[PDB]
């Protein structure tokens, strides 16, 4: 008896979740508009950075989530980072945010601006009152960095030790091996891989909400 109306009330909660999805959609719209309003402030930052040394490198180093990715040999690279901003998707397409990292001319790659994107959700998943605590993160878009010759750090040219068959003589062979670096999540794992996806999602969320709109507090 009661269970029937409880189930109907659950179906009602599903519509409540849909309404909340529309709420968060317009929340993203407000985020975009107010970001247009932030643009003068972020631009004034940009010109001010022209400059606070290694600004965003220090910002990342001071955050627990991000210091984990920045390796020592990375410091010469990320230090040439000149700015970071967030762009928000326009109406009609699925909600997403694009973190854009503006890099000055360097000796490590030619990309004036590098891009990376996160697509959020805007809908529930079934007829049960499924979880949606705002726009969460599924998937992510890696990109290729226009590295200079042999300047890639995501892969390291290790002189792996090998032995000749039968003879047994030792030798060194130059082979590319996956290397840990701050740039590694720019090539996220494809469709422990899921754990790394979740970690990257959380890191990008922290970049969007905490790092970028409050970069000064983290310097």
């Amino acid at each position: 008896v009661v269970k029937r109306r409880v189930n109907a009330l659950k179906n009602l909660q599903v519509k409540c979740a849909q309404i909340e999805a529309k709420f968060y959609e317009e929340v993203h719209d407000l985020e975009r508009k107010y970001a247009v309003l932030y643009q003068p402030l972020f631009d004034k930052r940009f010109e001010i950075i022209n400059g606070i040394p290694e600004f965003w490198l220090t910002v990342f180093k001071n955050v627990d989530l991000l210091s984990d990715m920045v390796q020592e040999h990375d410091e010469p690279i990320l230090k040439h980072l000149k700015d970071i901003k967030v762009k928000f998707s326009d109406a009609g397409q699925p909600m997403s945010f694009v973190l854009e990292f503006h890099f000055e001319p360097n000796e490590y790659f030619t990309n004036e601006v590098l891009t990376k994107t996160y697509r959020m959700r805007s809908e529930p998943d079934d007829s049960d009152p499924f979880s949606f605590d705002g726009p969460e993160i599924m998937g992510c878009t890696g990109c290729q960095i226009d590295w200079k010759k042999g300047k890639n750090v995501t892969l390291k040219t290790i002189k792996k030790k090998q032995k000749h068959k039968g003879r047994g003589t030792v030798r060194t062979v130059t082979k590319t091996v996956s290397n840990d670096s701050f740039f590694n999540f720019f090539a996220p794992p494809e469709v422990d891989a899921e754990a790394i996806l979740a970690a990257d999602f959380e890191i990008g969320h922290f970049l969007r909400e905490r790092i970028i709109p409050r970069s000064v507090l983290y310097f």
């Binding site: 009152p129 979880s131 949606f132 605590d133 969460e136």
Partner: protein, 649 residues
Amino acid sequence: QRLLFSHDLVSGRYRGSVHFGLVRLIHVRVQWYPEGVKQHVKETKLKLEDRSVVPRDVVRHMRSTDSQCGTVIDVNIDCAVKLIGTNCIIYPVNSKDLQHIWPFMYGDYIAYDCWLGKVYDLKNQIILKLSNGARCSMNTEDGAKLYFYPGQVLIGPAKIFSSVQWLSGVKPVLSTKSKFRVVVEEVQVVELKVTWITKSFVSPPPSVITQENLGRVKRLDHAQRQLGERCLYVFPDRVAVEVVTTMTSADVMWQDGSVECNIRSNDLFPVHHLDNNEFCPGDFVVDKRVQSCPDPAVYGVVQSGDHIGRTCMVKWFKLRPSGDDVELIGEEEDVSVYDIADHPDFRFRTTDIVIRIGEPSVGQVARVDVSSKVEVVWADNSKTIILPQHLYNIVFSVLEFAPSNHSFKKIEFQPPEAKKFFSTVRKEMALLATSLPEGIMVKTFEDRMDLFSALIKGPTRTPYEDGLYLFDIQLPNIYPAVPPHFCYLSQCSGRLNPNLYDNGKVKVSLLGTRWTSKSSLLQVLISIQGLILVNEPYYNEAGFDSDRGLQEGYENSRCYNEMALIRVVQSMTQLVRRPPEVFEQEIRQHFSTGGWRLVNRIESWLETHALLPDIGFPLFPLSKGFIKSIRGVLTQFRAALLEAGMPEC
């Protein structure tokens, strides 16, 4: 005397506070397991609380002056247990009461329908009850990151429960900003990859047995419950407990036959190393007397022995040709241990896995009875008696011609660069001819020039003194890149030297079993004169280097001096009786000069001991067993020399 040994429970100061710990490593390394990490600390700063006597362990009374040995049968552990999360401590709780935390564990032997096997790996899943009241199951791999025992309480972000199976209760919605709190009800084993070893009274079954077939898998049992081992206590209501203290009171069967049951372990100390001629009651042995026990079918079982006397009494058995029974050939007391040797095949000792051969079929050895039969715990079903018969267990010269059935055949030696090998051997021969003043000498056959053969004389004041030893050396194809392939001609049916194996193998650092292309046969001979034939050859098997200054070291070394004297006399006897086809004239000449001096020296040792002691190497406490064995072999050596035509000087 050393007073700590592996796994022993100790009390000492860590971070300035007294704490319990287990010694893990010795020549000491102590891990204060309750909360701490391994560190080195000496025993003078420490206070023992419970020694780690475990079955199969040979022990000696700490206080009693009698150095008699004994093997430990069973250990009774009265252990204090602290409940986890809480701090209630119950003492004394007997370890036989405590049950393992998981039904099966990594590598603990198991029995399938009719197969034995080690569990190489086991996939296990936890069963959780949520504060919501929902019951679920999860693989431990996912649960590793939940901030594993029945009744635990943990927390976890919702997403961790994505892959679980919701056994019962209302399924909660998984939101990234929800943190479940879980109480672990039971820990279960999902699958297990069995690395089978033996079939027990076709082909192996599936490696990863399906969960539905785990009900027939039976573990192994024994209690080695160490400090800090998670387990489940049952009230006289399973509760997760950690052992905070242990009370090792073990039963000991001593070398005199007495069974001193319920002796505090602190009064015992284990013997890391036996002289290979001790034989605690039950150790199967075979005779080495030339005349007695002509039939290979007979074997021996030692009943008791006097350590100071180095003499043990045995029963000789033989199998019945019909049926599966045994009969007693006869009891023989006053038998020197040197006349008996650890039986090649039967090596039954406590907690040794065994398989029944032509009901329970896989088990462990509990005690080797002084009688013929042996005691096996089939799983934990029952201790049963079974004969060994059906219980499987788990100077220089260049001689001409070629060596006749000698040195190295079936080789077809072919050096990749013969010219470089010749270049090497030229300088090797020059060095040998130039720097061999200690009498040691070598020779080379014309055919297969790599076939070196050397005779080595023992140094003075050592059991091998006047000891003549023949070595055949096959030079490798890629000499001097790698050490030579040595082979000691072995005929004594014994180990005259912890490295000179009866199979013909030799062992020393320079032989790589350090070496360099600059290394030469001269260096190897120098080593053989310095290490292989040394004052106390007991110090040359896979270590014992710590023993310098240890009383156990001295005792075992004296016994080994005795055994080496017996075996060198045996080797000389054989060599005189049936010498090889090479090195013969010099063997005659050596035996004429000093060969009879060996027997005279040994007899002088015996006479001096009887009167009371000379000097030269540890032999002074000559023992009844040594006297008997040395006389029995020395009369044989005299007979061989006489029939060989070597008259006394």
